[PDB]
Amino acid sequence: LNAVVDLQDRNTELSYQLLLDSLGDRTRYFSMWNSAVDSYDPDVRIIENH
Amino acid sequence: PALTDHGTLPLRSSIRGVQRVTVTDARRRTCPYVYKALGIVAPRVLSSRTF
Amino acid sequence: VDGASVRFDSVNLYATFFPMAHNTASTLEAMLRNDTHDQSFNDYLSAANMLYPIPAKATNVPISIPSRNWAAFRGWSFTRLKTKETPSLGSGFDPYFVYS
Amino acid sequence: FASLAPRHGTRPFMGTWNEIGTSQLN
Amino acid sequence: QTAVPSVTQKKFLCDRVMWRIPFSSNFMSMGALTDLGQNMLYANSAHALDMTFEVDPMDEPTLLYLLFEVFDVVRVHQPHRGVIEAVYLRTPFSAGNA
Amino acid sequence: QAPDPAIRAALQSQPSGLASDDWEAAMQRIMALTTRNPESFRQQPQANRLSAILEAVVPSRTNPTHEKVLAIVNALAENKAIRPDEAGLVYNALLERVGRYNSTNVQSNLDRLVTDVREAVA
Amino acid sequence: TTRVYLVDNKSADIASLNYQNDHSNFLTTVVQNNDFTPAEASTQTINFDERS
Amino acid sequence: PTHDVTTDRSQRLTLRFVPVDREATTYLYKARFTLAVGDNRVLDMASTYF
Numbered sequence: 001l002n003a004v005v006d007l008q009d010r011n012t013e014l015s016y017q018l019l020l021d022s023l024g025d026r027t028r029y030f031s032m033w034n035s036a037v038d039s040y041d042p043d044v045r046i047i048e049n050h
Numbered sequence: 051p052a053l054t055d056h057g058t059l060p061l062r063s064s065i066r067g068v069q070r071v072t073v074t075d076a077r078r079r080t081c082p083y084v085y086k087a088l089g090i091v092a093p094r095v096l097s098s099r100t101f
Numbered sequence: 102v103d104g105a106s107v108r109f110d111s112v113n114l115y116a117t118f119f120p121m122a123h124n125t126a127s128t129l130e131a132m133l134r135n136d137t138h139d140q141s142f143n144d145y146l147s148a149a150n151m152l153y154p155i156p157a158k159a160t161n162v163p164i165s166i167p168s169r170n171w172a173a174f175r176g177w178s179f180t181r182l183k184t185k186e187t188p189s190l191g192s193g194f195d196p197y198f199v200y201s
Numbered sequence: 202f203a204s205l206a207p208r209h210g211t212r213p214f215m216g217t218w219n220e221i222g223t224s225q226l227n
Numbered sequence: 228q229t230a231v232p233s234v235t236q237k238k239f240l241c242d243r244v245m246w247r248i249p250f251s252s253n254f255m256s257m258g259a260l261t262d263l264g265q266n267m268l269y270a271n272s273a274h275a276l277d278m279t280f281e282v283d284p285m286d287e288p289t290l291l292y293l294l295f296e297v298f299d300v301v302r303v304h305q306p307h308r309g310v311i312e313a314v315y316l317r318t319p320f321s322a323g324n325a
Numbered sequence: 326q327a328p329d330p331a332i333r334a335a336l337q338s339q340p341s342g343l344a345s346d347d348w349e350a351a352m353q354r355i356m357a358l359t360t361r362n363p364e365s366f367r368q369q370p371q372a373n374r375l376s377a378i379l380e381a382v383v384p385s386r387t388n389p390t391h392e393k394v395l396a397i398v399n400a401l402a403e404n405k406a407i408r409p410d411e412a413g414l415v416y417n418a419l420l421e422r423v424g425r426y427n428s429t430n431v432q433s434n435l436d437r438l439v440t441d442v443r444e445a446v447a
Numbered sequence: 448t449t450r451v452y453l454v455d456n457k458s459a460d461i462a463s464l465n466y467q468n469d470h471s472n473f474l475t476t477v478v479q480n481n482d483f484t485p486a487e488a489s490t491q492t493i494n495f496d497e498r499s
Numbered sequence: 500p501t502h503d504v505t506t507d508r509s510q511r512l513t514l515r516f517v518p519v520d521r522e523a524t525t526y527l528y529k530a531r532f533t534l535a536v537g538d539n540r541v542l543d544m545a546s547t548y549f
Contacts, residue, residue, distance in 0.1 A: 139304055141303065143298070143299065148297055150292070152292055157289075161281045166278075167275065169321070173318040175261055175298070178245050179245065180245040181282060182290045
């Protein structure tokens with residue numbers, strides 16, 4: 001008898017993504033879990049054209 | 051169109067929203083040539099368990 | 102379309118067990134089965150996710166929800182996505198999920 | 202005993218009697 | 228000393244984040260069970276929710292990914308060896324005591 | 326002395342705080358009959374103020390099967406009839422036999438045994 | 448007593464579930480609320496009593 | 500907390516006071532308001548800003 005009754009709307013994919021950030025910090029990479037936050041260079045997103 | 055019925059059999063206490071319905075053959079593989087499958091269940095109390 | 106796919110050759114499930122003195126593991130197991138103290142957890146993003154389409158060049162989008170009991174609501178949180186990027190996640194292949 | 206403080210199931214949350222405060226350039 | 232007349236444009240970019248409207252009296256987080264959501268707990272009323280979003284004239288089809296914060300929990304019974312039972316519960320969007 | 330198994334069993338199977346068993350103490354809280362502090366209940370949030378009222382008015386029937394058997398297996402260890410590490414095995418076995426054959430007579434005799442075994446440890 | 452009907456649902460909300468299931472191995476919804484969209488309804492559970 | 504933390508009557512979170520009298524000079528510039536902080540409510544001055 002299953003203990004993993006799972007619905008159709010809630011996504012554990014995004015929930016775990018937020019939890020890791022709240023639990024610790026995401027600046028430092030952890031290759032064992034392949035933890036590497038997709039980030040953009042802040043200089044290229046906002047072109048600070050000095 | 052084969053319309054028949056089957057007797058009572060145990061039913062789970064909690065029924066999820068989505069249920070799978072399958073019709074398969076002797077080899078336990080799905081027959082692709084089914085163009086309509088239906089199903090209707092009539093729940094009833096069989097016995098008691100808490101006692 | 103172009104890049105070939107992966108293939109799984111082996112899938113093994115690893116586990117790690119704490120060495121607990123059997124004098125205490127039995128006692129821990131004994132009381133942990135009385136249903137007066139049994140584990141209980143909550144999803145971190147405790148929310149029900151609903152998606153509503155927005156046609157192109159449409160500025161105003163109204164949505165409605167059929168009446169129900171908002172027993173223990175905790176607020177909304179919304180964000181706009183592109184339909185190209187969002188998969189279906191119902192079934193194996195959304196054969197329409199092209200962007201990667 | 203003004204309990205209008207958040208709860209933690211029961212036993213209202215917290216508060217240290219000594220914490221109203223001081224700081225200067227020193 | 229040649230500058231042409233000009234107009235000023237303003238905007239902002241707030242990415243990697245999702246907007247939030249906390250269902251509380253003063254938009255403040257004092258606990259998990261909000262004060263406003265605490266009123267309809269044992270009342271058997273049933274409200275209806277209507278929301279109108281006015282966003283932008285985008286060029287490509289888009290979706291409005293909306294979340295309704297709820298309480299989804301689970302109690303895990305383990306009476307006998309090899310027996311595990313879970314009792315799930317979502318209160319705003321009911322999901323049954325399976 | 327050897328600790329009482331029934332007290333020890335209740336020390337690991339019953340809520341530390343209030344349960345449906347402590348109904349008489351619960352009603353004193355929800356009606357300010359407590360000499361210690363009568364105004365405690367009045368100040369609670371509505372969420373856990375009603376849930377305490379509902380339980381007191383209509384008590385919730387429970388299952389004392391696991392509490393009784395835990396008392397016996399706690400008593401067996403003190404007489405050293407079983408090794409302390411075997412307590413996990415025996416607890417789940419007796420429980421299964423009682424489940425397989427539960428009935429009123431069985432439940433009552435388990436109760437006699439609980440009393441009898443207290444006296445036996447003594 | 449009641450009855451629950453297991454019938455093919457060609458609605459787009461349901462059809463998004465079984466993108467590669469024919470009429471012999473299809474999964475459909477049970478709860479049929481006239482107001483809930485099939486995507487939302489699917490979630491709900493019909494829960495019999497656990498004392499029988 | 501449920502009752503004694505937040506009110507139920509009509510109340511405005513943010514108020515906007517127009518200047519009641521303005522005096523100007525070549526270099527100086529003076530403005531004058533009237534705070535008029537309601538009743539049965541309390542304003543923390545570390546929230547006002549011109």
